[PDB]
């Protein structure tokens, strides 16, 4: 969907309505903590809205042109065994971004950083809105500097007439209750989001593609925006319950992948063009290393980069991973020191490592996170 850097536009409307939806569907018997956390969210509305639009204008990334259209089955294909060269990190998808920002949002909320938590939640919903955008051509036709397309700008001009204020039921009813049953957040998110994304693809072929009439387009915007709002409300509801009842999705399950969220210091020359790797060592002495390389310019000064690592051994618990590290290898003979500011490691929807560093890493050296 379309959006503007100041927290306005289609994206902002979606999260704003997601809140109103909850304000209306929330049953009276709901735990007061849930209702109280909803109120904290509402008073941080401007941050939720800013976060909901930020990913299309994020300048602390890889210096790449924005393109947020993925085939709904991408995440599922990446999750399958054998289908990926493990030495390489897995590319970020709309599906994975929802999970990452959700984990970061939960972590921040538990420690009282409501403003940051809400912003992160906004970013998670931004990506959910995207996968719910009915635009799936093989070849994209961008119309603005932020990578938006004509179907999104069309919906943008009409956003007000697509607003909904209810999911169609109360939180004690099926839609909402089903969302709480699956205690495995990452597993629930995958199936839940995939449903909206696939319906989105169907709508692209039957109503939103360029060859369809304006009437078809209006209808497509209407039904996918309703879906986006409802779906967003569902994610916010789950977040509220997760942070209120102190829920942890990683609870004793196998760690199939690890996600590194690395914040490079804003200091001059903090970034690096040298080869960068991440590695772990298990309690039993096993080791695995991955190359941290995404399509763009990795580890730029002041960037917040994400790397998804798929593990060899799929029978490991989080406590089985004893050490973790990042390692630099010189690209050229010339110096190019690297200064990470903070590194967060996420395992099964939980932020398991949050280490401030602010030290220069130079030459061919290994820096131990743990």
Provide the annotated binding site for Zn(2+): 1, 11, 56, 68, 126, 130, 136, 148, 152
265 scored as a contact of Ca ion (CB under 5 A): no
The only residue of 58, 184, 293, 320 in contact with Ca ion, by rule CB under 5 A:
293
Evaluate whether 122 touches 47 at the Cβ level (below 8 Å). Answer: yes
- Closer to Ca ion by Cβ: residue 56 or 298: 298
> Minimal distance in Å, beta carbon 294 to Ca ion?
5
Which residues fall within 8 angstroms of residue 199, CB to CB, at 6 or more apart? Answer: 224, 227
The only residue of 23, 257, 273, 354 in contact with Ca ion, by rule CB under 5 A:
273
Q: In sequence order, what DSSP letters do the residues of 115-141 get, joined into one string?
A: HHHHHHHHHHHHHHHHHTS----SS--
> Minimal distance in Å, beta carbon 122 to Zn ion?
12
71 scored as a contact of Ca ion (CB under 5 A): no
248 φ, ψ to 5°?
A: -120, 115
> Using CB under 5 A, which residues numbered 305 to 344 contact Ca ion?
336-337
> Minimal distance in Å, beta carbon 69 to Zn ion?
9
Q: How far is CA 45 from each of CA 17, 93, 109, 121, rounded to the nearest angstrom?
A: 11, 26, 15, 11
- Closer to Zn ion by Cβ: residue 56 or 298: 56
> Using CB under 5 A, which residues numbered 109 to 138 contact Zn ion?
130
The only residue of 16, 48, 50, 68 in contact with Zn ion, by rule CB under 5 A:
68
**Chain centre distance of CA 36:** 25
- Closer to Ca ion by Cβ: residue 323 or 364: 364
| 68 binding partner (options Zn ion, Ca ion, none; Cβ < 5 to 8 Å by kind) | Zn ion
* DSSP code for 271: S
CA dist., res. 262 & res. 355, Å (int): 10
Evaluate whether 155 touches 221 at the Cβ level (below 8 Å). Answer: yes
CA dist., res. 119 & res. 101, Å (int): 9
CA dist., res. 9 & res. 3, Å (int): 4
| 327 binding partner (options Zn ion, Ca ion, none; Cβ < 5 to 8 Å by kind) | none
> Minimal distance in Å, beta carbon 113 to Ca ion?
29
Chain position whose Cβ is nearest to Zn ion: 68
The only residue of 297, 325, 350, 367 in contact with Ca ion, by rule CB under 5 A:
297
């Amino acid at each position: 969907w379309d959006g503007k850097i100041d927290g306005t536009g289609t994206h902002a409307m979606i999260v704003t309505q997601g809140v109103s939806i909850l304000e209306n569907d929330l049953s009276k018997n709901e735990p007061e903590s849930v209702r109280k956390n909803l109120e904290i969210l509402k008073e941080n509305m401007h941050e939720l809205q800013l976060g909901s639009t930020y990913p299309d204008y994020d300048k602390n990334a890889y210096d790449l042109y924005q393109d947020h259209f993925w085939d709904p089955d991408t995440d599922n294909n990446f999750s399958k065994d054998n289908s990926w060269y493990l030495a390489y990190s897995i590319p970020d998808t709309g599906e994975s971004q929802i999970r990452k920002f959700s984990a970061l949002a939960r972590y921040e909320w538990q420690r009282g950083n409501y403003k940051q938590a809400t912003f992160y939640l906004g970013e998670a919903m931004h990506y959910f809105g995207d996968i719910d955008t009915p635009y799936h051509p093989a070849n994209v036709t961008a119309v603005d500097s932020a990578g938006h397309v004509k179907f999104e700008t069309f919906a943008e001009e009409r956003k007000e007439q697509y607003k909904i204020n209810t999911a169609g039921c109360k939180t004690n009813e099926a839609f909402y209750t089903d969302i709480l049953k699956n205690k495995d957040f990452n597993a629930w998110s995958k199936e839940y989001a995939r449903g909206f994304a696939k319906t989105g693809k169907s709508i692209y072929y039957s109503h939103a593609s360029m060859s369809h009439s304006w009437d078809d387009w209006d209808y497509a915007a209407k039904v996918t925006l309703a879906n986006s709002q409802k779906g967003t409300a569902g994610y916010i509801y789950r977040f509220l319950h997760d942070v209120s009842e102190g829920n942890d999705p990683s609870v004793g399950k196998n760690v199939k992948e690890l996600v590194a969220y690395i914040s490079t210091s804003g200091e001059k020359d903090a970034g690096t063009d040298d080869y960068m790797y991440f590695g772990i060592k298990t309690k039993d002495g096993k080791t695995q290393e991955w190359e941290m390389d995404n399509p763009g310019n990795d580890f730029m000064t002041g960037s917040k980069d994400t790397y998804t690592f798929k593990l060899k051994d799929e029978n490991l618990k989080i406590d089985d991973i004893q050490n973790m590290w990042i390692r630099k290898r010189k690209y050229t003979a010339f110096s190019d020191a690297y200064k990470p500011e903070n590194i967060k490691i996420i395992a099964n929807g939980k932020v398991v490592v949050d280490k401030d560093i602010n030290e220069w890493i130079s030459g061919n050296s290994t820096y131990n996170i743990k």
